[PDB]
Symmetry: C3
Subunit: 121 residues, 3 copies
Amino acid sequence: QKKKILIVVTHGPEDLDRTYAPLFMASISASMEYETSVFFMIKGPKLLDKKWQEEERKKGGNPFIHFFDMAKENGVKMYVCVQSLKDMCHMKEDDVVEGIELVGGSTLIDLTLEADRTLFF
Amino acid sequence: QKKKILIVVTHGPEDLDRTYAPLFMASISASMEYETSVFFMIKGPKLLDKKWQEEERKKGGNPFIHFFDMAKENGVKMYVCVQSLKDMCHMKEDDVVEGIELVGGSTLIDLTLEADRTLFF
Amino acid sequence: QKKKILIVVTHGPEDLDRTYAPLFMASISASMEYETSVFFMIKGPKLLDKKWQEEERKKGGNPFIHFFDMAKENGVKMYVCVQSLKDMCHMKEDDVVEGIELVGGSTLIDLTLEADRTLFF
Ligand SMILES: [Cl-]
């Protein structure tokens, strides 16, 4: 049975330095053939804003965008906490980039129980 | 056998945004019938100060207070690291709101080993 | 079989308050006869800079240095993420204090899987 790694991202662009590592780690994990998921919450959802990502892609040089894309290429599954998205980040569900599963906080409990190990950032 | 969830809170009012989520998560966990505990340390103990909580209750509108109370209503067990309380936060043991167990740091090691999963904030 | 505790340190001197606890925790864990390791990453590697540590030892009074030394006396194994060291912290490998194992990020995945429990700071 394949082992499962969950990575929790709780910072946004206000602290970008804390957002690179987790996504690079997600690619590393995936490359080692672990089924790897990332869960965005608290300010994490701001990293998934369509307009912010488009801005950063156009500017270039954003390491979060680089590692986000690498994680996606490596098959990393991604989730965003809707209570964080709406109530903490003041985003709409439609503001989230495609391919991220919108879930409630209960899903974090399920995902951490289902994973072999969870990393918190 | 009932499963056990531990949530570690390491921020205080200096970063309130990082304190809501963990306590909301504790209520969610409890509502799913997991035995749920919260462990306050580093600046976390400041959230448990009697005078601060009374101030915030009187002002209203503090989401930490809301989620703290909900967690308590849902039977969430709470612990505070005495070394953090005294040496980091400069609080007295008597400054802690009632119903929180005052423990040493060794207890975090026991609690994380005894829990099925631990969440870190 | 002896149980294994891993502690992850992600802050540096920019947030010293978040660096004391983890190292004190590492000594506590070791004193309880758990095989204990600390993994430094993100800004954590700055805590391991030779010149910074020498400065702080000469000034005195730095609690991180105190708890770092206690952890070492208690046999705590230490690792530093080379991608963090170089790319986030702009340090050279030679800038790291002796006795820390320089490793890639894949090693965090191995270490967290091999440990019974992991603490994240
Ligand atoms: Cl922080």
